[PDB]
Design an enzyme around this catalytic site. Structure first.
Site, mmCIF file in Angstrom:
data_model
loop_
_atom_site.group_PDB
_atom_site.id
_atom_site.type_symbol
_atom_site.label_atom_id
_atom_site.label_comp_id
_atom_site.label_asym_id
_atom_site.label_seq_id
_atom_site.Cartn_x
_atom_site.Cartn_y
_atom_site.Cartn_z
ATOM 1 N N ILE A 113 6.706 55.786 -41.605
ATOM 2 C CA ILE A 113 5.649 54.877 -41.165
ATOM 3 C C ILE A 113 6.168 53.452 -41.016
ATOM 4 C CG2 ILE A 113 3.450 53.843 -41.828
ATOM 5 C CD1 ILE A 113 2.904 56.634 -43.236
ATOM 6 N N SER A 169 -1.966 52.825 -32.772
ATOM 7 C CA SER A 169 -0.804 52.553 -31.932
ATOM 8 C C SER A 169 -0.580 51.045 -31.918
ATOM 9 C CB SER A 169 -1.011 53.092 -30.520
ATOM 10 O OG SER A 169 -0.011 52.605 -29.644
ATOM 11 N N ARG A 170 0.548 50.602 -32.472
ATOM 12 C CA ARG A 170 0.791 49.175 -32.636
ATOM 13 C C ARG A 170 1.169 48.478 -31.336
ATOM 14 N NH1 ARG A 170 4.017 48.397 -38.462
ATOM 15 N NH2 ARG A 170 3.376 50.410 -39.336
ATOM 16 N N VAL A 171 1.649 49.211 -30.335
ATOM 17 C CA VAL A 171 2.114 48.595 -29.094
ATOM 18 C C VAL A 171 1.562 49.259 -27.844
ATOM 19 C CG1 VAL A 171 4.212 47.905 -30.289
ATOM 20 C CG2 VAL A 171 4.208 49.986 -28.920
ATOM 21 N N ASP A 199 6.339 52.283 -35.236
ATOM 22 C CA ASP A 199 5.413 51.579 -34.349
ATOM 23 C C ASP A 199 3.993 52.138 -34.389
ATOM 24 O OD1 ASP A 199 7.820 50.877 -31.679
ATOM 25 O OD2 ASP A 199 7.272 49.733 -33.468
#
Ligand SMILES: CCC[C@H](O)[C@@H](C)C(=O)NC/C=C\C[C@@H](C)[C@@H](O)[C@H](C)[C@@H]1C/C=C\C[C@H](C)[C@H](O)Cc2cc(OC)cc(O)c2C(=O)O1
Ligand SMILES: CCC[C@H](O)[C@@H](C)C(=O)NC/C=C\C[C@@H](C)[C@@H](O)[C@H](C)[C@@H]1C/C=C\C[C@H](C)[C@H](O)Cc2cc(OC)cc(O)c2C(=O)O1
Ligand SMILES: Nc1ncnc2c1ncn2[C@@H]1O[C@H](COP(=O)(O)OP(=O)(O)OP(=O)(O)O)[C@@H](O)[C@H]1O
Ligand SMILES: Nc1ncnc2c1ncn2[C@@H]1O[C@H](COP(=O)(O)OP(=O)(O)OP(=O)(O)O)[C@@H](O)[C@H]1O
Ligand SMILES: Nc1ncnc2c1ncn2[C@@H]1O[C@H](COP(=O)(O)OP(=O)(O)OP(=O)(O)O)[C@@H](O)[C@H]1O
Ligand SMILES: [Mg+2]
Ligand SMILES: [Mg+2]
Ligand SMILES: [Mg+2]
Lengths: 485, 469, 485
Positions: free
Chosen positions: A320, A349-351, A324
């Site tokens: 983790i 979803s970070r991006v 991302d």
């Protein structure tokens, strides 16, 4: 000539000690007279330490060993498409020999800060939950994590199967080529997966790298790195690839075994201390390149098995901290029959929100947060307290949206078909439809849109975006259908 | 012949110096000649200085440094095929019945690679066991792997013997039973029961081959005996083309024996003192058991769980390999719920509406949700009693108690302990019974009528008997 | 001459290293010049590692060591009857030398699958709760498992004491010679146990092996194996023996000490991995042989202490997984004065039910299941108001039977005496008797039954079975007594 050759002093537990090989490079490949291959991990003042990819049983004391001159590397290129290979790129499907564009080292350093670019274009999975709630972009590293049999492979395979939409077209900027890595899986399971990808004609654009539990721990350790090098050939040429690692946890187990056989002391949870570095230097190889570097991409989907859903465990939290984001697959949802069972609260979803399809962002809006609010409300409403005002309303829509997100395996949806579904759900048109019919709604409504409003679906597909007129037309279509349904 | 002197002896581990250009390969078998019979050593390592290290298939007491060892030129090799049926074999392929040589035409190495990638095949045939909790909630796959997990005494050998009685004579092909590190008494009782039932005929055809290396055997024998049993099963699968069912009583004893020899080898241990290569050891054993296109192999494997700790590395390693797992819980058995199967921890690949059908999947899912709800309440119930629950909770808990009590069943092999004669319950009858229970149709019946009976018609008969009494 | 003699190189942690002894056998016995003895455990090209059966003080570097020429072995035969010996079979009672029929190795392989038979004849303990509820066959292994002070040794000692009603007869197939092994017990406790046996005349047929708490851990480890070898002489010569291993937990502790001083890797609870192999290769030696092997048998009763009553601990679950059942003694019952405190639910004899006396099988019936039901009914009914008639009769009958199964120490009953008591309890003729008068009933009824109806008791003893006429006459005898009583 002990510069270019050596003699096995001792061998056991898949490790051999070799005298000579004075010129050998660290991490070079050697071949034994018995024909097995091995990697020179330790160079020592009087001996080399080789780890054996095949079984030790063929190796004997006094065997001649010869050095290849090559750092451990694999064949790469387009000629691997449609092939199943071992961790060293030897074919195991039993078809002819592989044709390779070249060879690439297994261990290569990831592209640095300058050559990379922001993630800005989608990996369209065709899963309604993924594409709407936790969008993945090309070059993202989105973790898939969950208990065994919670649908992790089904999510990855449906993602691979969706790419059949674009991989038949000419536009190789849209074509996404797939790699799948089996580590510690049964030969049965990976052979059945191959047979499934053959049934769906997905093999013609897919590559499978398999190091099953029958295979020596060095092969199970190596297989993800060589699969990454295969995907990197596509990235570096300027094409887009996706790589799935159906268990990194099984690689970590194989590396723990190999470290113990190297007599390296264990660290936390008895894993070796650099078990982080093993995964991080792997996953940092997934990247989106800049236009100067040819715009290519490699997308990674590592899979992790949690124990009892414990995401706090050492290997889960390590991965983790690299990936991302994650898709978290929940046993409670899965065994309640909400499949793919994606927990909308713990998945993020970070991006990939920068890379989501714009029409799907426009129609989805707050839906990602709304479903978490619904889940909290439902966790309180199950107490049977009074549900007055918005609590009742949020329970109704949240149930129908949840019923709208479940999806059949091996049936990924086109984005032009998710957009009207998510529009109809978010705008509450389903509040009039009873919860048992929502699947019927999906099937007949897409039949109506695809029969009568194909103009709308073509414009959504080709533009990827809604104008106010196009959104108004989708409104009129939805209202008309729900009036008739 | 290649001959070598013994130079060290440490428990099961023997070092042999071969004093010549050619050494035996790894896994070769070497022989020592002994005041009774012979000792077999299997090569494990090359130490250097022409010295190999080897693991002993029998007791090393009385070995002397300088004693003479002779290489047989190949691995431990065991008789195979139809001549092995009806007969009892040790880890090195010798008969341990009194019935003379096995006299098979072939003998085959116990070490072999798994079936190739092209040879794999996989089924979704449900194997009807007649056991309600299995047939409902974790239906076994014919041609699949089944594991039974339990601590000491919880019932897994009685479970295997019930499976042998119900399945093994209904199955069309041959069977193989391997006892690994279990009681020599249990082996003798099994051999007698096989002769009495007629699965073995000493003057006729026999359907089962028996391989034993019991808990009196050294760790080398308890490690290798599973490979002899598996080599016989693989010969029936590939060469005969038969559908085989392979039973392995206590495969954990193979893994534990691997740890014991590993401790003498001097490797750095994994986890709670297990060997490294635990995972690859299990993979190399467990991958050979697959079904192939040549023939099916079902296998049922008991798995002891030390201190009941399911987190133990050997159970946790085994769970990865099995198509169906049945977990037997000490707490459930202490409630008198036999066969002690935990309904929630037991799971199967075949519990899929595409396989069981939608009705069965629905009934199983509603049973599982009911029992999971009861488990969620059980600590509130423990502190406050059932009176604090809601009416919906009180109904769900009463029905969950009835359901879990109804998953008990009298086994025919264990009527000595229960008095009630054994019952088989058909799969269809099970699913109809539990669906009718879920409908609430029998909520008026007392829980005792559900306990230890063979389906819902027996629940009604018992309830009538209780109401008349 | 270094072939038959050697020099001590080092001494510590109970291990001496010796140079020479080239011709020594693995596990041969050696004598040091101080007269202490050791077993040669591991053999190396340069040296031998020897485990001292004594204090390290007795061995010094440079001292001479001699081969004895034979594997560690013990004297065996009838000449040991009445004697107390150390783990090596030297006499410690001081009554003089031992007389021996021969010597037998300490480690010897248990009889295989074919020479065995099913157990079919009882070890009559004379404990009402054991003989009725958990019958033990000759050749069985029955674990006695308890918390501290819960009565374990009293149960075994009463079993040993009961035998004198047959060991004084002529019928050598009914005799049962006893062996008792004291491991880590105090010398004073063993001496008081020997005095207790000798004042009950139980010593003339009994052998005691002692390795007390001070005696070196190798002697405590060895003592059960040599006691097993003594019992095997009876097993192998067609006689019957009973061996009590009065704490196998203390043997496991001694083996943990020895293994950790050998630098063996610790496993679970720091016990060595082969601690199971330690107990199973011991307990597999108790067997019932076929008529081809002379029909002899060795019965074992191992004893275990559970800290806090945890039957789930490692060594308890190991020995439960080796033995053919267990007698579990509950501390709560023992302190409530229910003695011998047999827990009827958690104890079970997995093979001895075929060996129960048929008259006891007839009169006990479902008594074990009834008492297990009674305990759970009484658990709620301790607080549950408004008990039904069914629960009321369950409580009445279960309290009568619970009081009836209580028994005084050193007071084992004949089965001719157990049968009328269990009959009276199971058929409920006690239900009218006051709960405190049941002990008065037990002694007074037997006294009536001995004086008036002796024919029935002699017929039960001679036949071992009840015809319908004998059940009718025992019913008449019971009903007439209760009518008077
Ligand atoms: C595998 C283990 C993972 C690990 O356990 C986890 C910590 C992790 O690693 N990553 C998760 C990362 C991001 C996701 C969040 C940004 C957000 O997307 C969701 C929906 C959260 C869900 C929480 C509560 C819902 C509630 C109604 C809230 O109040 C909803 C809410 C409302 C709001 O008002 C505009 C603003 C908010 O940020 C939120 C909110 O945070 O909800
Ligand atoms: C130290 C380790 C402990 C370990 O945890 C334990 C499993 C072990 O090692 N050994 C005990 C194994 C078998 C013994 C049984 C056959 C039987 O003798 C007893 C009394 C059990 C006790 C359980 C519940 C009582 C209740 C009234 C029940 O309902 C009674 C009952 C009724 C019935 O109807 C015919 C059938 C039954 O099997 C039972 C039943 O199981 O009771
Ligand atoms: N959306 C779905 N609808 C129906 N069945 C599904 C769905 N997703 C997964 N399944 C089924 O769930 C079961 C387990 O899921 P899957 O095959 O993806 O395994 P997994 O979660 O990767 O587990 P493992 O650890 O065994 O590899 C399989 O039967 C799969 O067919
Ligand atoms: N049936 C009985 N009636 C009365 N007292 C008893 C009975 N059985 C045992 N006792 C007493 O209870 C105590 C238990 O003694 P015992 O020798 O049996 O202990 P143990 O359980 O072996 O424990 P430990 O070895 O830890 O001392 C002693 O006081 C013994 O006298
Ligand atoms: N289905 C059942 N019906 C009745 N009694 C049962 C059942 N299952 C188990 N038992 C009882 O529980 C115990 C089961 O013993 P069994 O030999 O089957 O256990 P196990 O798990 O194989 O143990 P071990 O670890 O000692 O090998 C015996 O007392 C048996 O009477
Ligand atoms: Mg998977
Ligand atoms: Mg068993
Ligand atoms: Mg005691």
């Amino acid at each position: 000539n002990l510069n270019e050759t050596g003699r096995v002093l001792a061998v056991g537990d898949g490790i051999a000690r070799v005298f000579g090989l004075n010129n050998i490079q660290a991490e070079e490949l050697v071949e034994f007279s018995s024909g097995v291959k091995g990697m020179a991990l330790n160079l020592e003042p009087g001996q080399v330490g080789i780890v054996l990819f095949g079984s030790d049983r063929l190796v004997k004391e006094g065997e001649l060993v010869k050095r290849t001159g090559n750092i451990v590397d694999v064949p790469v290129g387009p000629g691997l498409l449609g092939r199943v290979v071992d961790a060293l790129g030897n074919p195991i499907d039993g078809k002819g020999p592989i044709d390779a564009a070249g060879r690439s080292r297994a261990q290569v350093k990831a592209p640095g800060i300058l050559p990379r670019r922001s993630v800005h274009e989608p990996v369209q999975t065709g899963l309604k939950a993924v594409d709407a709630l936790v969008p993945i972009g090309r070059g993202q590293r989105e973790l898939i994590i969950g208990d065994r049999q919670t649908g992790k492979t089904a999510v990855a395979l449906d993602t691979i199967l969706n790419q059949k939409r674009w991989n038949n077209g000419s536009d190789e900027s849209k074509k996404l080529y797939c790699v799948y890595v089996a580590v510690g899986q049964k030969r049965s399971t990976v052979a059945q997966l191959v047979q499934t990808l053959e049934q769906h004609d997905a093999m013609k654009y897919s590559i499978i790298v398999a190091a099953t539990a029958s295979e020596a721990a060095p092969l199970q350790y190596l297989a993800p790195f060589t699969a990454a090098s295969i995907g990197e050939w596509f990235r570096d040429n300027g094409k887009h690839a996706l790589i799935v690692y159906d268990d990194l946890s099984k690689q970590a187990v194989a590396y723990r075994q190999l470290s113990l056989l190297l007599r390296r002391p264990p660290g936390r949870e008895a894993y070796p201390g650099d078990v982080f570095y093993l995964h991080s230097r792997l996953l940092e190889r997934a990247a989106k390149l800049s236009e100067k570097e040819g715009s290519g991409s490699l997308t990674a989907l590592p899979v992790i098995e949690t124990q009892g859903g414990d995401v706090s465990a050492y290997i889960p939290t390590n991965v983790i901290s690299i990936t991302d984001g994650q898709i978290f697959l929940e046993a409670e949802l899965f065994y309640k029959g909400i499949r793919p069972a994606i927990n909308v609260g713990l998945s993020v979803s970070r991006v990939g929100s920068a890379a989501q399809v714009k029409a799907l962002k426009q129609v989805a809006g707050s839906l990602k947060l709304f479903l978490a609010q619904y889940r909290e409300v439902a966790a309180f409403a199950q107490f049977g307290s009074d549900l007055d005002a918005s609590t009742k309303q949020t329970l109704v829509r949240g149930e129908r949206l949840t019923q709208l997100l479940k999806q059949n395996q091996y049936s990924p949806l086109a984005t032009e078909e998710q957009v009207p579904l998510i529009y109809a759900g978010v705008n509450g048109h389903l509040d009039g439809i009873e919860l048992s019919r929502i699947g019927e709604f999906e099937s007949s409504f897409l039949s109506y849109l695809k029969s009568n409003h194909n103009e709308l679906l073509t414009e959504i597909r080709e533009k990827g975006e809604l104008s106010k007129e196009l959104l108004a037309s989708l409104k009129s279509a939805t209202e008309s259908f729900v009036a008739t349904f | 012949p290649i001959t070598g002197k013994v130079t060290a002896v440490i428990g099961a581990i023997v070092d042999v110096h071969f004093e010549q250009s050619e050494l035996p390969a790894i896994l070769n078998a070497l022989e020592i000649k002994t005041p009774q019979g012979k000792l077999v050593l299997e090569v494990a390592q090359h130490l250097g200085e022409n010295t190999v290290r080897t693991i002993a298939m029998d007791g090393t007491e009385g070995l002397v440094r300088g004693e003479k060892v002779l290489d047989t030129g190949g691995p431990i090799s065991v008789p195979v095929g139809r001549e092995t049926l009806g007969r009892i074999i040790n880890v090195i392929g010798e008969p341990i019945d009194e019935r003379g040589p096995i006299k098979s035409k072939l003998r085959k190495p116990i070490h072999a690679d798994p079936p190739s990638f092209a040879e794999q095949s996989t089924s979704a045939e449900i194997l009807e066991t007649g056991i309600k909790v299995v047939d409902l909630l974790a239906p076994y796959a014919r041609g699949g792997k089944i594991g039974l997990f339990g601590g000491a005494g919880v019932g897994k050998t009685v479970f295997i013997q019930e499976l042998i009685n119900n399945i093994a004579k209904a199955h069309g092909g041959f069977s193989v039973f391997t006892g690994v590190g279990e009681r020599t008494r249990e082996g003798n009782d099994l051999y007698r029961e096989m002769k009495e039932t007629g699965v073995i005929n000493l003057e006729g055809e026999s359907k089962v081959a028996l391989v034993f290396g019991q808990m009196n055997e050294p760790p080398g024998a308890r490690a290798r005996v599973a490979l002899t049993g598996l080599t016989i099963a693989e010969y029936f699968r590939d060469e005969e083309g038969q559908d085989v069912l392979l039973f392995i009583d206590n495969i954990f004893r193979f893994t534990q024996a691997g740890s014991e020899v590993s401790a003498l080898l001097g490797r750095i241990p994994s986890a709670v003192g297990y060997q490294p290569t635990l995972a690859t050891d299990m993979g190399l054993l467990q991958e050979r058991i697959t079904t192939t296109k040549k023939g099916s192999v079902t296998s049922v494997q008991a798995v002891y769980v030390p201190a009941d700790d399911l987190t133990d590395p050997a159970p946790a390693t085994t769970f990865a390999h099995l198509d169906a797992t049945t977990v037997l819980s000490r707490g459930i058995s202490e409630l008198g719920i036999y066969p002690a199967v935990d309904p929630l921890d037991s799971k199967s690949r075949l519990l899929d509406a595409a396989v069981v059908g939608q009705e069965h999947y629905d009934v199983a899912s509603k049973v599982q949700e009911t029992l999971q709800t009861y488990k969620s309440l059980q600590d509130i119930i423990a502190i406050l009693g059932m009176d604090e629950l809601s009416e919906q909770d009180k109904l769900t808990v009463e029905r969950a108690r009835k359901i879990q009590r109804f998953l008990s069943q009298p086994f025919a092999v264990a009527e000595v302990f229960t008095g009630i004669p054994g019952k088989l319950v058909r799969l269809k009858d099970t699913v109809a019974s539990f669906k009718a229970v879920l409908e609430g149709k029998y909520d008026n019946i007392p829980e005792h009528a559900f306990y230890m009976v063979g389906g819902i018609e027996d629940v009604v008969a018992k309830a009538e008997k209780l109401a008349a009494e």
